[PDB]
Amino acid sequence: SEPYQIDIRRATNTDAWGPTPKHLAKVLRNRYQVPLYLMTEYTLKRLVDHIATRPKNLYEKARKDGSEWRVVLKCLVVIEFLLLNVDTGDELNQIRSCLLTHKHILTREIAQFKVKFGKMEIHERGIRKKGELILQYLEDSQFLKKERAKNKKNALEH
């Protein structure tokens, strides 16, 4: 129910469109009131809960009440945006250690991700590539550093 949770939900909804840059700006702005660790943990929880609510087979599929992949991709887009946009030191380190504490999400669940359903293969590829990128940011701090520097190039153009 917290404002930061509402902002993360909005940025990572089931709609076919977004997050917009405003949705992402809004999320980032919660860092004035909320630890990055909690923002990152919540985004990961939502990703995990949406992966787990999916039927494992056609029996279960017909018995519980195929666009859950969008929530997953959007949660990864949010994670990337934060890694690129938070402040060096405290903020970045809270994101990284939250991701490192839950590394299996990236190394296994996203790495092995299967979309269910006619564009299953492309959506699958977009999810796996995004998780590769987040992994690269964690494995190579120098690459993340330079990517963070380039991200500031046009920061006051608005």
From Swiss-Prot:
ENTH domain span: 2-148
Subcellular location: Cytoplasm; Endosome membrane
Extra remark: Present with 8100 molecules/cell in log phase SD medium.
Subunit structure: Interacts with the clathrin adapter GGA2 and the clathrin adapter complex AP-1.
Function: Involved in the recruitment of clathrin to the Golgi network and endosomes to form clathrin coated vesicles. Plays a role in the trafficking of clathrin between the Golgi network and endosomes. Binds to membranes enriched in phosphatidylinositol-3,5-bisphosphate (PtdIns(3,5)P2) and, in association with VPS27, is involved in protein sorting at the multivesicular body (MVB).
Name of the protein in its database record: Epsin-5
Originating species: Saccharomyces cerevisiae (strain ATCC 204508 / S288c) (Baker's yeast)
Primary gene name: ENT5
Positions spanned in the full protein: 31 to 191 of 411
